[PDB]
Amino acid sequence: MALSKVKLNDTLNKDQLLSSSKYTIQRSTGDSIDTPNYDVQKHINKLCGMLLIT
Amino acid sequence: MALSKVKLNDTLNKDQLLSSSKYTIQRSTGDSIDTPNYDVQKHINKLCGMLLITEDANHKFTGLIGMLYAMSRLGREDTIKILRDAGYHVKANGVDVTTHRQDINGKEMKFEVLTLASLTTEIQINIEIESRKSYKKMLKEMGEVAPEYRHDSPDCGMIILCIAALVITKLAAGDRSGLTAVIRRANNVLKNEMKRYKGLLPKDIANSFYEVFEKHPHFIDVFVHFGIAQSSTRGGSRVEGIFAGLFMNAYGAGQVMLRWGVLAKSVKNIMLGHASVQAEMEQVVEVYEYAQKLGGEAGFYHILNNPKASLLSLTQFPHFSSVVLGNAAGLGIMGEYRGTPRNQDLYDAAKAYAEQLKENGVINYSVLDLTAEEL
Amino acid sequence: MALSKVKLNDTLNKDQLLSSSKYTIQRSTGDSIDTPNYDVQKHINKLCGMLLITEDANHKFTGLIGMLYAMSRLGREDTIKILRDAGYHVKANGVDVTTHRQDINGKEMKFEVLTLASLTTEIQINIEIESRKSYKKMLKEMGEVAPEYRHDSPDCGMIILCIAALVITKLAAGDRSGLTAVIRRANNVLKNEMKRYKGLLPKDIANSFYEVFEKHPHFIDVFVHFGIAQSSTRGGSRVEGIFAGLFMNAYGAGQVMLRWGVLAKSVKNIMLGHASVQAEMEQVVEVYEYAQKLGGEAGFYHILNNPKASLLSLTQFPHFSSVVLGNAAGLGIMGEYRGTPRNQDLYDAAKAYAEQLKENGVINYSVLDLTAEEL
RNA sequence: CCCCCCCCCCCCCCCCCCCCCCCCCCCCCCCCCCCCCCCCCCCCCCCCCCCCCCCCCCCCCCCCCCCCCC
């Protein structure tokens, strides 16, 4: 009754902390990244096949 | 009934008071502070790497340089915002990259430097000079430098901030006493990184971070919120996964006594029944529930010097503290912990019972029921 | 049933009356008051340090100077706002830094001084003159002065406000009687600081603060709210962590009798069952619940002279007071406390039972249940 | 048809209060250990098979209601 009510919820407290940050970091991945669009998809698939038949 | 209803809630009353101030103080941090933006981040990482490839590197400035990376991850605006939230007046200092021309060894040379209040463009080039020396030597040894060994590796910034996180871990004691523990862990956890960087000297960088935190105590706030923002992240390199893991080991520093309490309750240590401990209970619950109410932010209260952390002390309850600490003793978890029981008789009794507990595990069959058991 | 329903709630009725006044008084504090703004804060800190490095420093003005630092942390606007909230008409006095030219030892010199109603630009330079003397002597002794020893250290302002906090601690009694207790604590708690500053003389500064509080009693309000605003803080230097801790030791000064009540209930002191104590209970609960309702602000009611503090007195209940004080006696917590029981017979009985309580801790097994215990 | 008696009310005493009593008073910063995490294996599926089938409209009588008294 008395002591059995005393506990600390650490797992959920920690989630609550990481979920509720008021600030954010941002990383600089590298100099470039290629973002191929839908229009190029068929050509990339073709290129993949070239590797598979080799 | 009559008297059992009389109580005073002091722990929560005190929180209520500090939470509801109608006025505020503001501190004047110093003359300048550099707030590197996202755009500078890659260059700072590069500079971090230069330190890591430099064998027997001078790590005096590494602490400060690490803080700069962290701030360049938060971004100029986010970093100022966290300073102002903490309450410090901020002379923000914009950080740009300029080229510098200087003749080293007679021959004139170009260098990529940052405009920094904290760092002379002199001592900057000196890191790049020293790095090149350790680099050409590295190139001679293995013929060709792999990408994991160079100062380019995206990990470099975060690698340095790893021993920073470890410094935060032991910052609970407030002095340099965690240092040997910091080294120990940096050696097991980070052993792979130390293999790729001759300049990853734990003792030295750990000292340089202790240095920057002690000197500029507002950075300790900045770093804590950076780490939080870094641990908020959705995914990341194994190193960032290491950083976050280490950083979070510091959640709940200074409140070890609190967790050892939950333990004493969990193992049902007999000395909790003692009359003079039962007398304290009413209040010891008050504080545990206050911890609960506070939630996540609470864990770091001791690392930042948040006045409200005094409130989580179980010191105010000598009889309970003593049996809790004795329980932890008898279960062999304390030491070389420097906490002292205020009640030797209770501590000894709790320790004695605790030591006896690990000896006999009795199987409790009423947690899981079965309609037919032959055995 | 019939008569048991008849009661008068006096404690809460009285609060209700003082809370709901339709009119207000306003006091005319004096001719001027200096309200230093954030911009002056660093200079005041510097001036504080000058006092701390001065060996055998004259601490007459240190009390007043401390108040100035605190006000320069609150800021001109926040500081006026707290004066007006307290109800005092304020002749605000703007604080600017001007240069002063005067020939000391024949040679003409420059000085950085503040335009202050309270402080002559004469007695200001005298602190800087005296500091330089103790500084060149300090430079001769250790060859080079470390940053922890100089008047630059960002701690200096807050260090002085530490013994100020300690003065608040013992201000409950209203006289200088706390002084020896103040010194005692300043010596254990602040021993590190006293090592770095030859001018950190507790007796002297404590007297200087007592002086400024007694003389200008509105400052005691200002300081209390500063300390609250300082304890609201999110993080801070170890010194600010010390300040906050000490400041909060004063929460609940004057209401020690109240906490010793909760104690008497907690240890289940038998003399609480006595018929003539049971008669008081109905009302003694009224006051404890009033304390509860009031919340945080209540703790400081005695330090500021808030009329509503009279209401928390347990003095009005002689029989209860006596057993509570006797309980505290028998548990060896009172003394050299100068409270007297109004019922010697009860006090003695409570003390006697209390003394017997510490002798036998009986283990109570019905707080934690186990489905199978061999022992 | 309904209806039908009697009948104003009131009437004494009486201000209220009155004692004692500020309050407070001790002690006490806090903290201190250890510790990343993780690690096996593994696609999923796999048969049979439309449904339905009969009978079968519904209906059919009797009957206004009302009527006293007051």
Tell me the C-alpha distance between C245 and C249, whole Å. 6
Q: How many of the other CB atoms lie within 10 Å of CB of B21?
A: 17
Interface of C with B in 159-198 (CB under 8 A): none
| C304 Cα distance to chain centroid | 9
Tell me the C-alpha distance between C38 and C36, whole Å. 7
Element (H, E) at C108: strand C108-114
**Sign of the CA dihedral with C213 first, then C218, C222, and C224 last:** positive
In 3-state terms, what secondary structure has residue C49? helix
Contacts of C39 (CB under 8 A, 6+ apart): none
Instruction: Give B-chain residues touching A10 at CB under 8 angstroms.
Output: 252, 259
In chain B, which residues from 192 to 221 place their CB closer than 7 Å to nucleic acid strand D?
A: none
- Looking across all nucleic acid strands, the nucleotide with the smallest C1' to CA distance from residue C312 is D23
In chain B, which residues from 128 to 187 place their CB closer than 7 Å to nucleic acid strand D?
A: 169-170, 172-174, 177-178, 180-181, 184-185
Residue B212: which domain range? Answer: 1-375
Residue with tokens 């007999």: B270
Inter-CA distances, C249 with C147, C175, C233, Å: 30, 18, 17
C336: preceding bond cis by omega (within 30 degrees): yes
Q: Check if residue B294 sits with its Cβ under 7 angstroms from strand D.
A: no
Q: What is the DSSP letter of C143?
A: S
Beta strands in chain B (DSSP E): 27-28, 33-34, 88-89, 92-93, 97-103, 108-114
In 3-state terms, what secondary structure has residue C317? coil
Element (H, E) at B167: helix B156-170
End-to-end CA separation in angstroms for chain C: 49
**∠ CA C225-C228-C231 to the nearest 5 degrees?**
150
Amino acid letter, B225: H
Tokens of B227: 């780490």
End-to-end CA separation in angstroms for chain B: 49
Amino acid letter, B67: M
**Within a 13 Å sphere around the CA of A4, how many CA atoms are in the beta-carbon half?**
7
User: Exposed, middle or buried: residue C270 (CB in 10 Å: 0-12, 13-18, 19+)?
Assistant: middle
Angle between helices B156-170 and B41-53 in degrees, nearest 10: 80
Closest among B175, B326, B299, B186 to B243, alpha carbons compared = B186
Method of determination?
Answer: X-ray
Q: What is the DSSP letter of B230?
A: H
Tell me the C-alpha distance between B77 and B98, whole Å. 22
The angstrom resolution of this structure is: 3.6
| C366 Cα distance to chain centroid | 42
Inter-CA distances, A21 with B226, B235, B358, Å: 10, 16, 41
Overall domain count for chain B: 1
Q: Check if residue C310 sits with its Cβ under 7 angstroms from strand D.
A: yes
In 3-state terms, what secondary structure has residue B190? coil
Query: What number of helices (H) and strands (E) belong to chain B?
Result: 15, 6
Instruction: Give A-chain residues touching C367 at CB under 8 angstroms.
Output: 1-4
Tell me the C-alpha distance between B50 and B57, whole Å. 9
Distance B202 CA to D42 C1' (A): 43
Q: Please answer whether residues C92 and C60 qualify as being in contact, where contact means their C-beta atoms are separated by less than 8 angstroms.
A: no
Q: Please answer whether residues C266 and B280 qualify as being in contact, where contact means their C-beta atoms are separated by less than 8 angstroms.
A: yes
Contacts of C309 (CB under 8 A, 6+ apart): C254, C301, C302
Phi, psi of B89 (to 5 degrees): -60, 130
Tell me the C-alpha distance between C329 and C326, whole Å. 5
B296 → closest Cβ in A2, A4, A16? A16
Closest CA to D28 C1' — which residue?
Answer: C249
Closest among C329, C337, C319 to C358, alpha carbons compared = C329
